[PDB]
Design a protein around this ligand. Structure first.
Ligand code: HEM
Ligand code: HEM
Ligand SMILES: [C-]#N
Ligand SMILES: [C-]#N
Lengths: 253, 253
């Protein structure tokens, strides 16, 4: 084999011989000189990972549903080469299991993407828990997707209650009945409305109590659908104080 | 082979004959009785990917460092299946490679993860550009990781100027020289929900001017290190209307 970025390997169930290709030994961090061995292989694997490999080899000898295990050999320094081993059985004319044959795949890119996603989700939960303004995310038909802690305290809905509801549950009439059409008309666009301007509206808690609020939308695209992130600033204290200011001034005459 | 979960295929450059695994037939969504053929393979690809596959076989036909391209096949309607095709060259006895041979991998999970990360990154840029409050993310040593649009407007640094700088560039003395010690003193504390307490500090613009500000922090853990997300609110206008309210409340008392 030449230029195959995949390694290959074969483990006879009868003679316990293991042979692998040249790219296979480089992936394991094994030299030229070192001969192929079932025990050299289990030595490149940190302890618990060995148990998973051998338990999987015995299970593939039994029921025989394939072999798929992934592991990190300490191949370089201490960050390692992630590898996914895949294999299936070879039988003889009698149909006894004889050879376990398959591949080693480099999966360092796949594990890097997997952990970049994990960090993103952990950061999203952190923003959702922590942002002082209510943050609401909706899809292109107004259905709430994400709902921050500040939004739960402001609107009286838990995020499990809110998610999957229309965002219109947060609104008094008439905006409540019209909000789907405000979104639909923007989705026709030609930019008559700008999403970024910001506006003061009235929202209402699950109470039925209403309150002034300012909010800001940002738009994003994903998977052929728009999504909108809203940040809500309660203005009850802001308008109690400016009211007291105007009153005091006009009274001092 | 048996429960390999991977298809194998061997195409000859010279005879254009193709043999695929039985497991590879299910991946292409067709072939219950119809024999393998190179024309039938390109028939399952969309006529944008089949152009890419032909360029890839030509590329490896003349000095190719392997063969590695991925594509979505329709499989069956509403059942598109992403797969990754990998292959290498193999020689006869002395001359140019007889047959180009390799594997078909099911990569539906890999591309769900890739798309989920892509959605997360798009959302973070949207949040960063839309959020009204200055959002700043630092690592365990106070190095700025992220810097939102409102942060650049408020502090006077671009994100490209800010990222990789210590967060203490945003503060005056004495806090500027002590902020690193605040972070390390906190990291050897282990009590949760002390970062959750807000505080009123003074910030410093790159301008050199100072302003009162409130901010709130959330911790997260990733990769062995903490990260902190600050939400900064300018209090300049809040403290001056609150001062002109209660000094116009003392015109009579
Ligand atoms: C809960 C209180 C809310 C109220 C009372 C409200 C009200 C409104 C109004 C009055 C308009 C259009 C005004 C006009 O064209 O005459 C509008 C548009 C829109 N709103 Fe809301 N809204 C609320 C929350 C939200 C949230 C939280 C989001 C997104 C996360 C959102 C997304 C949109 C979109 C996409 C549009 C169409 C484009 C635009 O004009 O900005 N709304 N909304
Ligand atoms: C912009 C100007 C800032 C100033 C003037 C400032 C000031 C301070 C002060 C005075 C303390 C310690 C209070 C005490 O010891 O009693 C502190 C602690 C801390 N700061 Fe900042 N800070 C600023 C921005 C930030 C930002 C944006 C973040 C994070 C993204 C941050 C992260 C921390 C952390 C993690 C601590 C320790 C946790 C705590 O006890 O509060 N700082 N900062
Ligand atoms: C919605 N504004
Ligand atoms: C920083 N507080």
């Amino acid at each position: 084999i030449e230029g195959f970025g995949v390694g290959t390997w074969d483990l006879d169930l009868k003679t316990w011989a293991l042979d692998w290709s040249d790219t296979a030994r480089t992936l394991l961090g094994i030299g030229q000189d070192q001969p192929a061995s079932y025990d050299l292989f289990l030595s490149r694997l940190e302890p618990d990972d060995r148990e998973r490999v051998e338990s999987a080899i015995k299970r593939v000898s039994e029921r025989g549903g394939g072999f798929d295990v992934s592991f990190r050999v300490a191949g370089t320094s201490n960050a390692g080469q992630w590898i996914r081993a895949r294999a299936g059985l070879i039988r003889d004319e009698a149909g006894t299991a004889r050879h376990l044959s398959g591949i080693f795949l480099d999966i360092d890119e796949e594990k890097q993407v997997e952990g970049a996603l994990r960090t993103r989700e952990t950061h999203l939960r952190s923003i959702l828990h922590t942002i002082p303004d209510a943050m609401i995310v909706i899809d292109g038909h107004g259905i709430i997707q994400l709902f921050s802690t500040a939004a739960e305290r402001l609107f009286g809905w838990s995020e499990l209650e809110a998610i999957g509801q229309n965002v219109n549950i947060l609104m008094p009439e008439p905006d409540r009945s019209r909000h789907d059409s405000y979104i639909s008309r923007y989705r026709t666009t030609s930019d008559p409305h700008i999403i970024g301007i910001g506006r003061i509206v009235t929202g209402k808690r699950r109470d039925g109590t209403t309150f002034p609020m300012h909010l800001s939308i940002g738009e994003m695209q994903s998977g052929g659908e728009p999504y909108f992130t809203g940040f809500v600033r309660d203005l009850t204290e802001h308008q109690q104080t400016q009211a007291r200011l105007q009153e005091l001034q006009s009274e001092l005459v």
